[model samples]
Target: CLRANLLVLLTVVAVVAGVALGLGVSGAGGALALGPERLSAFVFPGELLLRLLRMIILPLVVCSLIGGAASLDPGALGRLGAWALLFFLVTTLLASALGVGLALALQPGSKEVLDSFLDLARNIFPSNLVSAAFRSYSTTYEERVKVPVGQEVEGMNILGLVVFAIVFGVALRKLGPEGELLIRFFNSFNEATMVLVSWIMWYAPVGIMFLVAGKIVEMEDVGLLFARLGKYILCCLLGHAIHGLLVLPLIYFLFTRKNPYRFLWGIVTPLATAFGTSSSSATLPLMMKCVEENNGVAKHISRFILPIGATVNMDGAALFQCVAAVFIAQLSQQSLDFVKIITILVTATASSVGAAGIPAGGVLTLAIILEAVNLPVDHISLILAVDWLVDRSCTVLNVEGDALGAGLLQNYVD
Candidate 1:
């Protein structure tokens, strides 16, 4: 806990220093405003950060999704398993919907980045697996009204790759011993990527310091950006609060007919751990202990369902990405249509499956969502700047969702 907290502390410090440095360098006062060359140099470390994240994204998605799917194949076999997985899946979609709904209502930022659900559908099942790495499908309209022309967008077809990875993973496990080799490869590759992410996280402070500072120098309206950022943060927190406090509890009450807050109270220890630690898996064992012993959930569920939830049931991440994705698009001042909005919903939900167990939770998956909907990935630093503060709230919602899922599943276990 201390270790992870320290890391988050460094991250928070990085964002602060970056903002302060940027404010100073901007000539608001920056003396020279540094000019383009010096300003670019200031942002170079952050650019490198973005490059490194993008570099590992392909392998990270393929390996993580495959390994996560392979492991779940056995866990999702029976009626109980089906219910458990279904509950997780349904809630994932709902949480994503809430995020999109709230974000759109909140008008944090705006997506045309997505043209039609057909394009979204086409992107999900890439025609060529090789091409999935570099380009996803897109549709462009001529003028205000014309038949949309299909084109290849120069971003990873994350949805197609994610879809293929899950099926590939499930198939590998079906092969028994033959499958073990490939599973190990995916697991090993995923583990290697984890190490790389940990390495990158340590470097985050320096990069972010420069990153924010650079943005500061370049911004035409710093105060407006700050207001928008503040509002964006509110939208994210509001979404989490609604899901955690209202929607999730309401669902629990509807099905279980018990006091939802009382059940949640039992898991507060783990929630706090999740809040402080910012990792769902880190809070798992304690959540298990709380649910099984304190909340009186059966061991079968605490053992089975909670672990699965840890990997794939990232409700808060889905929410954050939607808010962030929409926020990014709106800041660009593009008007979102039906397909674009639904694309946010679908992409956020589906990508959560592949986004399992990312080091910084939603950062990588935010890239996937942004890329999927044809939004700019570069501006992620906007959210990344405040994520250390934001993610704790998200982690709390995630663990709470898992605990509540276990609390609800207790009746089904026997």
Candidate 2:
């Protein structure tokens, strides 16, 4: 498994380097500059792979949560749920604050660029189930598929889905024998989803190669892209590093009064996997295993908290969104007063929950923030060039947060 994981990482690096070199040789002519046919050919596999991953996410979250929840004692479940929610919300809020602070202090984008990058509040609560389901699968780029805006898009209300799954699982748990059969059914389904993830991962190298290469080829000026966004990127990384290395570990030590470094060392495998895959949801299975066998987190706590964390925690993504929002505002020469900054804090935290735990998933929900703040959505393209690299780091932080949450919660479980 380690060998396979390393292979995928090397493959991604090799492909990106090869593509960057190819673009250099070809005078940086992007895919569109080449030909429509070639561009389509280049992106097909990657796009399909993304679709497959997206396909698995809903089922994976629902079944895993339902099955995990059903297995827990009701009193234990309630206590864990309350603590876990509090932990996630507090960490996420702090992450948002850290991101905003860093972005403001760093001032990554300039006023001149701000003018160029200049660019919604939408209802989040869904009135009907069908609309909620529809919104869940919708993409930011909707030309391929006509998806409704806001709560009508598929996957728009992941929080809603999570809530529904919890209630449904709790309801099933109350049904006694019938619930047992249903829980067993979902357990089997969850196993099948894992099997599907394994099969899809076999294609990861090929898919990631295409994805990275296609993205690289699409960049108009790689150097300029970095030069313009370099400061913004640094600020975001600083925020993540502070949160991951300092903030989270501090929390762990304060709670458990133990050296969190040992826990970090134990979960290195999952952290590495998260860095390579850049998808906490994809890394979920590995995270669960590493925390249980390596870090010695109890199975009950690991099973319940880790899955929910994968779906909802999103500390890294929250920080990124906050920084990105401020960066965009700075670039647009927009004044972010007290109210605007508060808006960013709230929106960034909320948006991160809705963010898909996949590679470049943060970019998808970025539109929601821009729309909320009325920043230019088109400017996201400027940041796309570096998103893949940044995404890996963010995912590493996200998984680490989950593992730490599991360990901390373990102290309370008994």
Candidate 3:
């Protein structure tokens, strides 16, 4: 069991070691100071970690969701998806609301424009499923050009695949006894994929150390940047804690009437990976592995909720976006009115979910929210300075919400 839990122990040390290692090379200033070129090369293990994790994703999503859907039948599949998405909206709005309040308390200057609502829906019915693997069908505007661009972005349209797989699975179930053959095939493949994922956990901390160090070395000047946005960073981090530590647990307890921390405790390994990767999507395999194995979530429930949640749910994004919007509004010395506060919640929720299909996640969505509230768009630059830390925490919260949502829904499945 300790060997199983060793991933967390190793990962935490990796983060600490990375900070110490980078602070040395960054400050000591020498041949090592001219690093990050070779440092980038040194980060090979980390890149391999990401790439290997990514390699598992397409197969895992298809197999996991198809088998999950087939096992549940069309009726159960509908309820599961509906409740999971309900969790998405409720938590995101609350998180965003928390973000706004914290920014007001901190009173700092803050926060991209891609309104992604149209694209989010468009990706679901992608004209070609082949393109779905490589590109999310999206839209981008070029100002004063005769261009309302129909974009084919490199964002993995996992959303499209998720929808299609669920449909295909339900149809497979319709064939009664015979359909199970195919369903069993996918389940078998899924198990094998997870085994590979589990083994990758050992290699993870090796990569995680370099990942964090690479990020540290890459930042132009970490310390001065931290000082400039001290309050702003506080606003984002504090909002994340409130939502993750207080709000989510309360909701979990209210519904489950069980030990929420015990449930939360189960996913430490996945959370650590999420921190290193700064991505819910990239961390999908480990999230599924930990929730099912450690948290005792049902394989069907784990298979069903997490893939969808990994993409669509944006608990941390909603929270951070709201804080960033308010903080940025503060930058212009423009106080948010009652109307503007509500606008941030509405716009942030839209952009956050829409960001599911977007490539780089929330900053661009932050731009959309700022524009909605008529904040200075260019002020988006300030948030970029501190985004690395904020992004990692957001990923941590994002996957945590997914794990907790699956925990919350486990009873309903029973």
Q: Where is the poorest 10-residue window by lDDT in model 1? A: 109-118
**Model 1, span 161-273: residue lDDT tens:** 76787778778878889999998998798668656765665665576566556655665455665665777888889999999999999989998888999887677655654
lDDT of 2 by residue, 48-129 (tens): 7566666776677678778878888777789889999899989999999999999999898711212212211122234555
lDDT of each: 0.71, 0.73, 0.82
Which regions of candidate 2 deviate over 4 angstroms?
Answer: 1-34, 110-151, 155-157, 253-295, 298-300, 328-343, 356-400
Single out the weakest 10-residue window by summed lDDT for candidate 3.
109-118
Where is model 2 poorest over a 10-residue stretch in terms of lDDT?
110-119
What's the TM-score of each model vs. the native? 0.57, 0.73, 0.94
Tell me the TM-score of model 3: 0.94
Could you tell which candidate, 1 or 3, scores higher by lDDT? 3
Q: Quick one: RMSD of model 3?
A: 2.4
TM-score: which candidate is best? Answer: 3
User: What's the lDDT of the predicted structure labeled candidate 3?
Assistant: 0.82
